[PDB]
Ligand binder design. Structure first.
Ligand code: K
Ligand code: K
Ligand code: K
Ligand code: K
Ligand code: K
Ligand code: K
Ligand code: K
Ligand code: K
Ligand code: K
Ligand code: K
Ligand code: K
Ligand code: MG
Ligand code: MG
Length: 1333
RNA sequence: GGGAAUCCCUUCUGCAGCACCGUUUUAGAGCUAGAAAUAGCAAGUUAAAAUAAGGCUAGUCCGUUAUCAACUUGAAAAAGUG
DNA sequence: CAATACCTGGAGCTGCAGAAGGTGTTCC
DNA sequence: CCAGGTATTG
């Protein structure tokens, strides 16, 4: 018996179907196991496995790193306390103990309830003197008096526990950075360069303007308005804009051809400045550096809003400013409300539920919610103008601990910490001996290239130690081998050379690697002149001359430079034709010119002796990122260069790696030639063999050595190999499930392998990314559209508005503005038409006033539109508002537009699968099926793995009226699998020559016509003009029949119409978090869970809502009443995720601890989520939890109703005669509507049992019977949510909402029939649970 | 058909370092008229500690991804069964 | 029990490797 | 978003 297998691989389902010779689906009697009447069951060999989505490891990683951070914060605190131990025991022998038990209730506290001093009077005195911690911090910074050791500890520990970010390298001293000074010095430098054009900065208050709480552009405009004759886009304007953090374009300031856009935040800036400084000279360096100093001052002024000359604690002083203004404004607001609207007073200052001040301080109201609640109250009253000004500045009634404190660097907390240490080391000797130790506690942070400081028990770790001892923040450099750890950080992640697997890959920017790339591109170039008979390769001498004259003197080498600076200058050619390179050479000696600028010794760079040295240096710049480690490694080459060059070398850094090893580039040699690969690239007679030819030439030893160097390590398992595939973890879950399904099907047929296996793989917060892209593009563009049109991230989920902002509010085809309020009138057009490229992303879509303005609809936007709009498109591209692909597609008309080959290739793409993950699935199935080799030792392909795209079966469904409606049931996955099998087998049977295209293993108009008409052999009348085809379609050579249009369509229809389809929902143990993360307040409830072993939730609160890993069926007895009489029970106990390890270690003890006695151990049944139970009248339920259920039946709606619903709802057209055809059918069969309702009702009454909902639904349907047929069908589609398999959900018929009727009791399944299903569902074990207990 | 190096993007997986909130219990003596419920007023901004229970391997480590119908032997691994 | 309504931790910043989609070149 | 936990109300 012969058969084939059709598969449909998706992120949540795997459809499967078995077909025979005649495209029929078999049906077998399968044995049924268990304790019920039934011993076997008839199963059709078609179905679909369903499962929850597989998740990325991202959430787990975030939680893990934050666990580590919490541990390390606690450890910092413990380090500090260890330092304070002895002298604090002298001062207060229970201070740290009161601190440790601060969370406990007075009942459980073993010491006095007041933490700091242990008596109420001293505590209240402290709090009256220091209402906030910043008061004590500033006092300890400024005062000369000896202080209480407890308060010293409190200030230092508050600084260490919340130490601030590390986004700034080097030190920081707030007294040196002052806006009023750096502005003046910038003016000094500017006026020194431009003596003829000086700026009068007198009377200009730089402090208030630049440090104002205003947007960057507004402060720029203010400062500009203070200086007459100087515009905002002038030199000084752009200097101030660079200082303020904008993206000014210095091109127009210096008449540059290169656009000098400079943003201080961008990582590229260090080069972006140097490059600019290479064009305008180094006299302007001092200027562009003074501007950066001013930027530093402004950024600090954002945080420190107080004069730094009255205190050495400007941060704490600004916090005290917050507190004092809060107090003053609160007093004023209370008085104002009392005078004008006292009745509101309570609601504002006593109701925590309301977003007033009461909900602000005591409730859950945020600063933003409180501002929103109180703004109308301030506008309504009189005297609130200053309070309103503070509100619009986000500076009213501010707390001290807020969201925006992330700006504070750690250097500032350190600046106050060191001050307090300097103050109090005069009175405490252990503070003098341990000053640097505490500073190090604050400042030391484990480097990212070191990772967890493990000792052989962390799979995430890689750190190697210099000595086996406990690592601390003070002995890190001596215990941790930072070099080996930073090296292993990278080497554990980089690829080896595939050709020489034992050799490490060269750095991407290695000098040898760039030499290789340049010579490899250069060897294949060819040139012709007049006297030449034939194009000729470049000799080794010509290549060396081109490298020395062009590649070693120009950053890039254009074709024009090749024609003029060489062929004309050297070869005396006035005209030459070049091939093998277009416009410019892709390769370039970038590292060569980098090191030429840094070291300024070209003879050193050209000398072959220094090669090694240079290589090492570049690698040291690529392998590392810490400038101290870079300096240490380059110290060996300290003698070679000056200290200036050495500093400039430290600064430059490289990221990225190549793909080939040095032992391959310039390592292995040919036995007879004695030449390396790079030697052959430099010169190879008149063959000019490049890399590929060199390593594939049998006349050379390279290929021999390549294979000889190949090792093969240990083989991966199926799961290991699937995990290591590049793809989404969800689709990998689907792939593994697919392979398991195929294994079980092969076992079903009787270990007979199928003829073919047809596979189809489906296609494939965000609003935050959209807002980030638009902000970056608009601020890089310099446009003010966000000022004039504010928008939230959610709003960008509208396609037209997102396109509007990506296009800066302009038509993309016409150089004109677009209106927001008229987006409904505009058009969204595909750049390359969707008839050729089925692409609906933003990358191929464009917002325009009218698509007519694109030109002809049959091609790429016309040449006229490109000439009009290329500059605007390039602006959008540099602003990253449009991608490279969008820009290249938009401008393709200037490059000939769409050729006929392009259209043929697009049609071919629509039908042939080129995705790599699909090829990997095909390879897995192929290697699992075909295992034997023939006489020539070549693979014997018994099973052909065909891969198809979705459009094939989609158009097949639309062309022969085998419609799908996804909401009706889950049968459409299995039907997709069956249709895949049918179409694929028939397609390769009709055209065997397509095997190379469609089977795994080893004129443009002609192919366009061919691939566009590949699927016409199913049709009877082609209408492409109206050709006809035979009723029987056979193979041309074999004469074998592939399709009988009279009989086979009926076969497919019968197969689709069959009601019994093996839908199996994958039963899965729940994993992840223990419960809801929210820490609830204390409450009299046994649903609360302790956050620590001794924290009784009735006193301290805790968690509730724990996630059940899996339920367990318990047959035992429980004590009843005060008498504790044993009463037999049979019930479901949900083992929570947190209870799982304890329950599995010893289930009997766990269950007895829960109250169960005499537990029948052998009747304990493990029931994961979605466990299937069947009841009366075939009614099924799925275990949603231990006390909640899900719908477990499928509504097998007949095929006539499904097709009617598709056609009537305008689901997705064709000829207008065929449109009237479909329509007249819909209108003739309107009586189906009622029938469909009936079919639903009889279903819901039999299986769903949602009486109230069903009656509401019937009323809703009878209410809208006068609605158009299309709309009634569209809402009948929604109706199927009531009958859909799985969890109940709310749906909506028109404007009536039907709330889900959840199943909140699981008692009935305790006497129903449990169903254990194999992966296909063909094999069942059914257990009658009524026979238990 | 498959594959490779290279220019230019773009997206997606994996990992490590760090902050800022939030929340929870406690500490910041509420006062006065009431027997009392309650009324009138005062006040509020800060901190400690925990942030998966916890584990042994005791590290400044690990603890939320992947994998899982049933049954037989198996300690597990696995293999086998219609 | 069953209807019903509400609830869910936010999601900054730095550094790194890799495969893979899209154009284009030179090749096995 | 989803959908399972929770209290409330009855
Ligand atoms: K990431
Ligand atoms: K006590
Ligand atoms: K001006
Ligand atoms: K609050
Ligand atoms: K090029
Ligand atoms: K680097
Ligand atoms: K899991
Ligand atoms: K899950
Ligand atoms: K490529
Ligand atoms: K209190
Ligand atoms: K299963
Ligand atoms: Mg912990
Ligand atoms: Mg806090």
């Amino acid at each position: 018996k012969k058969y084939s297998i059709g598969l449909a691989i998706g992120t949540n389902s795997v459809g499967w179907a078995v077909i025979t010779d005649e495209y029929k689906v078999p049906s077998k009697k399968f044995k049924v196991l268990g304790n019920t009447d039934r011993h076997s069951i008839k199963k059709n060999l078609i179905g679909a496995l369903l499962f929850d989505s597989g998740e990325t490891a991202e959430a787990t990683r975030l939680k893990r790193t934050a666990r580590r951070r919490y541990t390390r914060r606690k450890n910092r605190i413990c380090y500090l306390q260890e330092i304070f131990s002895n002298e604090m025991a002298k001062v207060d022998d229970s201070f740290f103990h009161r601190l440790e038990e601060s969370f406990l209730v007075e009942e459980d506290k073993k010491h006095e309830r007041h933490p700091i001093f242990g008596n109420i009077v001293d505590e209240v005195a402290y709090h009256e003197k220091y209402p906030t911690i910043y008061h004590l911090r500033k006092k300890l910074v400024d005062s000369t008096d000896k202080a209480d050791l407890r308060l010293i500890y409190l200030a230092l520990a508050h600084m260490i526990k919340f130490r601030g970010h590390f986004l700034i390298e080097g030190d920081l001293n707030p007294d040196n950075s002052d806006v009023d000074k750096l502005f003046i010095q910038l003016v000094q430098t500017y006026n020194q360069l431009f003596e003829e054009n000086p700026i009068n900065a007198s009377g200009v208050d730089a402090k208030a303007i630049l440090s104002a709480r205003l947007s960057k552009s507004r402060r720029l405009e203010n400062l500009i308005a203070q200086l007459p004759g100087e515009k905002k886009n002038g030199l000084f304007g752009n200097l101030i804009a660079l200082s303020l953090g904008l993206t000014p374009n210095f091109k127009s300031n210096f008449d540059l051809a290169e656009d000098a856009k400079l943003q201080l935040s961008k990582d590229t800036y260090d080069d972006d400045l140097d490059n600019l400084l290479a064009q305008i000279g180094d006299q302007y360096a001092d200027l562009f550096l003074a501007a950066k100093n001013l930027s530093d001052a402004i950024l600090l002024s954002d945080i420190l809003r107080v004069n730094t000359e009255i205190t050495k604690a400007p941060l704490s002083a600004s916090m005290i400013k917050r507190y004092d203004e809060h107090h003053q404004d609160l007093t004023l607001l209370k008085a104002l409300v009392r005078q004008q609207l006292p009745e509101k007073y309570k609601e504002i200052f006593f109701d925590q539920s309301k977003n007033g001040y009461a909900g602000y301080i005591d409730g859950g109201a945020s600063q933003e919610e409180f501002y929103k609640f109180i703004k109308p109250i301030l506008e309504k009253m009189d005297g609130t103008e200053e309070l309103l000004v503070k509100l619009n500045r986000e500076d009213l009634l501010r707390k001290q601990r807020t969201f925006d404190n992330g700006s504070i660097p750690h250097q500032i907390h350190l600046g106050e910490l060191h001050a307090i240490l300097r103050r109090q080391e005069d009175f405490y000797p252990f503070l003098k001996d341990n000053r640097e130790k505490i500073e190090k506690i604050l400042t030391f942070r484990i480097p990212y290239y070191v990772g967890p400081l493990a000792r052989g028990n962390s799979r995430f770790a890689w750190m190697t130690r210099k000595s086996e001892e406990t690592i601390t923040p003070w002995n890190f450099e001596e215990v941790v081998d930072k070099g080996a750890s930073a090296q292993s950080f990278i080497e554990r992640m980089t690829n080896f050379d595939k050709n020489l697997p034992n050799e490490k890959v060269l750095p991407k920017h290695s000098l040898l690697y760039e030499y290789f790339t340049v010579y490899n591109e250069l060897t294949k170039v060819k040139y012709v002149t007049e006297g030449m008979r034939k194009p000729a390769f470049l000799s080794g001498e010509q290549k060396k001359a081109i490298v020395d004259l062009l590649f070693k003197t120009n950053r890039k080498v254009t074709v024009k430079q090749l024609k003029e600076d060489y062929f004309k200058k050297i070869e005396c050619f006035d005209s030459v034709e070049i091939s093998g390179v277009e416009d410019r050479f892709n390769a370039s000696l970038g590292t060569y010119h980098d090191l030429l600028k840094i070291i300024k010794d070209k003879d050193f760079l050209d000398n072959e002796e220094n090669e090694d040295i240079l290589e090492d240096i570049v690698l040291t710049l690529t392998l590392f990122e810490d400038r101290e480690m870079i300096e240490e490694r380059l110290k060996t080459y300290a003698h070679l260069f000056d200290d200036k060059v050495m500093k400039q070398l430290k600064r430059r850094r490289y990221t990225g790696w190549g793909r080939l090893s040095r032992k391959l580039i310039n390592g292995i040699r040919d036995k007879q030639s004695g030449k390396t690969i790079l030697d052959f690239l430099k010169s190879d007679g008149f063959a000019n063999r490049n890399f590929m030819q060199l390593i594939h030439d049998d006349s050379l030893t390279f290929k021999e050595d390549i294979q000889k160097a190949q090792v093969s390590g240990q083989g991966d398992s199926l799961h290991e190999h699937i995990a290591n595939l590049a793809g989404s973890p969800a689709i990998k879950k689907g792939i593994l499930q697919t392979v398991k399904v195929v294994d079980e099907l092969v076992k079903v047929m009787g270990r007979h392998k199928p003829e073919n296996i047809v596979i189809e793989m489906a296609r494939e917060k965000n609003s935050r990314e959209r807002m980030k892209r638009i902000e970056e593009g608009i601020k890089e563009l310099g446009s003010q559209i966000l000022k004039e049109h504010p928008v939230e991230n959610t709003q960008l989920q509208n396609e037209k508005l997102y396109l509007y902002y990506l296009q800066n509010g302009r038509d993309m085809y016409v150089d004109q503005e677009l209106d927001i309020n008229r987006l409904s009138d505009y058009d969204v057009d595909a750049i390359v038409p969707q008839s050729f490229l089925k692409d609906d992303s933003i990358d191929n879509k464009v917002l325009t006033r009218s698509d007519k303005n694109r030109g002809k609809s049959d091609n790429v936007p016309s040449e006229e539109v490109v000439k009009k709009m290329k500059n605007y498109w390039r602006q959008l591209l540099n602003a990253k508002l449009i991608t490279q692909r969008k820009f290249d597609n938009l401008t393709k008309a200037e490059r000939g537009g769409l050729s006929e080959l392009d259209k043929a290739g697009f049609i071919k793409r629509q039908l042939v699968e080129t995705r790599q993950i699909t090829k990997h699935v095909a390879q897995i199935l192929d290697s699992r099926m075909n295992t034997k080799y023939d006489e020539n030792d070549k693979l014997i392909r018994e099973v052909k793995v065909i891969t198809l795209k979705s459009k094939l079966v989609s158009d097949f469904r639309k062309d022969f009226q085998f419609y799908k409606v996804r909401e009706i049931n889950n049968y459409h996955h299995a039907h997709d699998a069956y249709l895949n099998a049918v179409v694929g087998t028939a397609l390769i049977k009709k055209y065997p020559k397509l095997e190379s295209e469609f089977v795994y293993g080893d004129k443009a108009t002609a192919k366009y016509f061919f691939y566009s008409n590949i699927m016409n052999f199913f049709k009877t009348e082609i209408t492409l003009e109206i050709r006809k085809r035979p009723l029987i379609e056979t193979n041309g050579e074999t004469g074998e029949i592939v399709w009988d249009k009279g009989r086979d369509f009926a076969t497919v229809r019968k197969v689709l119409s069959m009601p019994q389809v093996n839908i199996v929902k994958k039963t899965e143990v729940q994993t992840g978090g223990f419960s809801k993360e929210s820490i609830l307040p204390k409450r009299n409830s046994d649903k609360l869970i302790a956050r620590k072993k001794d924290w009784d939730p009735k006193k301290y609160g805790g968690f509730d809502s724990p996630t059940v890993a899996y339920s367990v069926l318990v047959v035992a007895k429980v004590e009843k009443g005060k008498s504790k009489k044993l009463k037999s029970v049979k019930e479901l106990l949900g083992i929570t995720i947190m209870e799982r390890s304890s329950f599995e270690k010893n289930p009997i003890d766990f269950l007895e601890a829960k109250g169960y006695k005499e537990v029948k151990k052998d009747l304990i049944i493990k029931l994961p989520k979605y466990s299937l139970f069947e009841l009366e009248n075939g009614r099924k339920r799925m275990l949603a939890s231990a006390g909640e259920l899900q719908k477990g039946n499928e509504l097998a709606l007949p095929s006539k109703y499904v097709n009617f619903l598709y056609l009537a709802s305008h689901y997705e057209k064709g000829s207008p005669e065929d449109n009237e055809q479909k329509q007249l059918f819909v209108e003739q069969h309107k009586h189906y509507l009622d029938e469909i309702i009936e079919q639903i009702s009889e279903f819901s009454k039999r299986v769903i049992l949602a009486d109230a909902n069903l009656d509401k639904v019937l009323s809703a349907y009878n209410k809208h019977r006068d609605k158009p047929i299309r709309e009634q069908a569209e809402n009948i589609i929604h109706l199927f949510t009531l009958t859909n398999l799985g969890a109940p959900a709310a749906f909506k018929y028109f404007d009536t909402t039907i709330d889900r009727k959840r199943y909140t009791s699981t008692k009935e399944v305790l006497d129903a029939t449990l169903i254990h299903q194999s992966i296909t569902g063909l094999y069942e074990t059914r257990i009658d649970l009524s026979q238990l207990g």
